[PDB]
Amino acid sequence: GQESAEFRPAELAGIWQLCHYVSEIPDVPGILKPSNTFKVLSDDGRIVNFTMIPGKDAIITGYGTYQQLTDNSYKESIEKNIHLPMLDHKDNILEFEIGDDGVMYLKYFIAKDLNGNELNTWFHETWKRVGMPAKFPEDLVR
Amino acid sequence: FRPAELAGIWQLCHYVSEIPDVPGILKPSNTFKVLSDDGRIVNFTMIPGKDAIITGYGTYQQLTDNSYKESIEKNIHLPMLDHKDNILEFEIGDDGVMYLKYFIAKDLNGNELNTWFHETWKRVGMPAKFPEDLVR
Amino acid sequence: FRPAELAGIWQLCHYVSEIPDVPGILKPSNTFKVLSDDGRIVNFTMIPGKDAIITGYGTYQQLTDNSYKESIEKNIHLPMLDHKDNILEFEIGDDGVMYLKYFIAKDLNGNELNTWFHETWKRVGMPAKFPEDLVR
Amino acid sequence: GQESAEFRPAELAGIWQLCHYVSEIPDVPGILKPSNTFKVLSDDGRIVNFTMIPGKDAIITGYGTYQQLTDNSYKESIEKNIHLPMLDHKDNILEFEIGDDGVMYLKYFIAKDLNGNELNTWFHETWKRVGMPAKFPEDLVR
């Protein structure tokens, strides 16, 4: 049997880099800058989150499968997530907005923590599609 | 062939010593090879504080117990491999470290290169604990 | 004036948030200001995996309880300050964080800039323990 | 009173970056690459060693005063050294060679560890003088 196909496919597949907002000044909102975490949304329906640790072994922090649900939401069927352990063996529904600039905004809701405490919190994330630049930088530290 | 567990995320490594003229010890670096279940390969390199970059992609397929092919579509690190097959010999240890070798005869301009390439890659895994101080 | 403990090694900081339109929390970055006892100032920036670079130098002198001058010889980040004095207002907290402000009117080509600069710096210290996994 | 001035002054003063040797291949010696540690040899006779920790607070690992002794040796009079605690409140004599290419080789001998165990080991280090490049890189992450 087939999961529901009744959505307009979005360009979810890709390697995505987590971003954050950086300001030089205390009380002023920051501008978008890339960070150290990647989400691989594979062409064959698998999801992996992993984080670099400079000079050390990178680590997977979550993995599973994913499935688009509606024109602007998809689920991650998480097997294990060490960043967010209350999501283990559960579905997380992510609402998304993908811009032609390669920036994807995600948000998801979590009701309870692992100890059953009320949380009722929306999480918000900004991701940027990783691409191939025109030129191989001559001094790249591989 | 006996199917090897190639599919996964791999981190490039190098060897470091504090002194010259001695072998170094293995240390992870900034480049990743994503080998998907459906036979896609992507190499990308993190650049601290900047956008990561894809440096090659295509498809791949295991051929024998110690070799696989990358059918490269585009590779900006190794552009003589564009629309070519590269055959890689591989050995994967029980410690999750994979040693690759491959040979390239010519550069894109037809100059003789006749170079053997060696790469060490380590399988990226999920540790038991999320580190308290992690910079995501 | 009451002499402030300016002499030392200072690390530039910035503010980070996971979401837009909110204030971020303080995080250290890659640039250092070395304020020597003999009144020399050097700014340099680490570039991961590459050679660090000096981006400015000169001399400095405390003027009042909350200001000091940098007499810049050369600054490739801020080249309108070459052979000029920059007056910085400073406040150093009990947590070792120093807040700097300064104002620059013109760029090197004479274009009006009239910009206030804010910098947050943190005093670099010696922790009680050398971390076991440190990458020197 | 004055410490001995009977040496030909060398160009020790500077900010120095610790280097190591990197190879892509297991059993082959590496080439010189810069690492994350700095030694400030000040114009006014003070020494500080410190190490970056990417995304985190940098740390001082040793400090004191220094004094050239001979044409190719100097001492670090170490107050505290958390990298090498057997050097606390002691002099360490470093033999050096400074190249016109800005590379300095250092070596020093340590007899005993902090617990009094025999060590009798020569340490060897390679350092590179930090300089001001021609151009401010446009995309520098400060």
Domain chopping of chain D, boundaries: 1-142
Where residue C18 falls (left for φ over 0; alpha for ψ -120 to 50; beta otherwise) is: alpha
CA-nearest of C83, C74, C84 to C104 is: C84
Beta bridge partners of D31: D22
- Superfamily of domain B1-136 in CATH is Uncharacterised protein PF14869 family, DUF4488 (2.40.128.490)
How many other CB atoms sit within 10 Å of the CB of residue D123? 14
For strands D14-23 and B8-17, give the pairing. antiparallel
Q: How far is C31 from chain D (nearest CA, A)?
A: 5
Q: Which residues are bridge partners to A93 per DSSP?
A: A75
Q: Count, in order, helices (H) and strands (E) of chain D.
A: 0, 8
Question: Are D113 and D88 in contact, with CB atoms under 8 Å apart?
Answer: no
- Return the number of CB contacts < 8 Å for B and D: 65
Compute the Cα dihedral for A105, A141, C28, D81 and give only its sign.
positive
B100 CA to centre of own chain: 8
Contact present, D55 and C50 (Cβ < 8 Å):
no
Q: Do B57 and A33 touch (CB under 8 A)?
A: no
Selection from A42, A100, D25 nearest residue B39 by Cα:
A42
Q: In the structure, how many helices (H) and strands (E) does chain C have?
A: 0, 8
3-class SS of residue D5: coil
Query: Per the structure block, which two tokens stand in for A137?
Result: 């930088």
Taking CA D103 as the corner, what is the angle to CA D42 and CA C34, rounded to the nearest 5 degrees? 25
- Best residue in C13, C17, C18 for a mutation probing chain A (most A CBs within 10 Å): C18
List residues bridging with B122 in a β-sheet: B11, B97
Which stretches of D45-140 are assigned E, i.e. beta strand?
46-51, 59-70, 73-81, 90-98, 103-112, 118-129
B131 touching C (Cβ < 8 Å) = no
- Quote the longest CA-to-CA distance of chain B: 52
What is d(CA A105, CA C107) in angstroms, rounded to the nearest whole number? 38
Cβ-proximal residues to A99 (8 Å cutoff; 6+ apart), any chain: none
Instruction: Please tell me the distance in Å from B135's CA to the nearest CA on chain A.
Output: 7
Helix-strand-coil split of chain D, %, nearest 5: 0, 55, 40
Residue C29's alpha-carbon distances to A69, D31, D62, D128, in angstroms, are: 40, 28, 21, 22
Sign, CA dihedral A77-B121-B53-B88, equals negative
The phi and psi torsions of B88 (rounded to 5 degrees) equal: -110, 125
Q: What's this structure's resolution in Å?
A: 1.7
D93 neighbors D69 (Cβ within 8 angstroms): yes
Which token pair is C102? 């300064």
Instruction: Please give the backbone phi and psi of residue A85, each rounded to the nearest 5 degrees, phi first.
Output: -65, -20
Task: Mark A43-71 as b/e (b = at least 16 C-beta within 10 Å).
Answer: eebbbbbbbbbbbebbbbbbbbebebbee
Q: Report strand pairing: D103-112 vs D90-98.
A: antiparallel
d(CA B126, CA B98): 18
Distance CA D49, CA D127 (A): 12
What's the CA gap between A70 and A83, in Å, rounded? 26
Residue in D15, D34, D83 closest to C34 by CB: D15
Burial classification of residue C5, based on how many CB atoms lie within 10 Å of its CB (0-12 exposed, 13-18 middle, 19 or more buried): exposed
Nearest alpha carbon to residue A66 among A44, A37, A97, A96: A44
- Chain D residues with CB inside 8 Å of C124's CB? 50, 57-60
Distance of CA D129 to the CA centre of its chain: 10
Q: Tokens 């013109």, residue?
A: C106
CB atoms within 10 A of CB A20: 23
Q: CB–CB of A131 and B42 under 8 A?
A: no
C64, C56, C15: which is closest to C35 by C-alpha? C56
Among residues B117, C104, C19, the alpha carbon closest in space to that of A126 is found at C19
Contacts of C30 in chain B (CB under 8 A): 49
Tokens standing for residue B25: 């010890």
Is the four-CA dihedral D96, C125, C11, A33 of positive or negative sign? positive
Read off the amino acid at residue A33. Answer: K
Q: D1-142: which CATH topology?
A: Lipocalin (2.40.128)
Using CB atoms within 10 A of its CB, is residue A125 exposed (0-12), middle (13-18) or buried (19+)? buried
Q: How far apart are CA D66 and CA D64, in angstroms?
A: 7
Q: What are phi and psi of B81, to 5 degrees?
A: -90, 0
Long-range contacts of B61-65 (CB under 8 A, 24+ apart): B62/B1, B62/B3, B62/B4, B62/B6, B63/B1, B63/B87, B64/B1, B65/B1, B65/B2, B65/B4
Residue A44 phi/psi, 5° resolution? -110, 30
Query: Helix, strand, or coil here: D87?
Result: helix
Give the long-range contacts of residues D92-101, CB within 8 A, separation 24 or more: D93/D69, D96/D10, D96/D12, D96/D72, D97/D72, D98/D10, D98/D11, D98/D12
Q: How far is B63 from chain C, CA to nearest CA, in Å?
A: 36
Element (H, E) at B53: strand B53-64
Closest chain D C-alpha to C47 CA, distance in angstroms: 8
| CA distance linking residue D40 with residue A12, whole number of Å | 49
Query: Does any CB of chain C come closer than 8 Å to the CB of residue B48?
Result: yes
- Contacts with D61 (C-beta within 8 Å, 6 or more apart), sequence order: C126, C130, D37, D49, D50, D51, D81, D82, D83
Q: Are D127 and D103 in contact (CB under 8 A)?
A: yes
Q: CA angle A96-A98-A102, nearest 5°?
A: 140
CB contacts < 8 A, A to B, total 118
- Nearest chain A residue to B77 by CA distance is A136
Sign of the torsion formed by the C-alpha atoms of A50, A51, A54 and A55: negative
Q: How distant, in Å, are the alpha carbons of A99, C41, D51 from that of A115?
A: 37, 52, 39
Structure tokens given for B132? 């308290």
Residue of chain C whose alpha carbon sits nearest to that of B49: C48
Could you tell me if C18 lies within 8 Å of chain A, comparing CB atoms? Answer: yes
The answer to whether residues B60 and B68 touch, using CB atoms and an 8 Å cutoff, is yes
Contacts of C76 (CB under 8 A, 6+ apart): C55, C56, D132, D133, D135, D136
Distance CA C12, CA C46 (A): 11
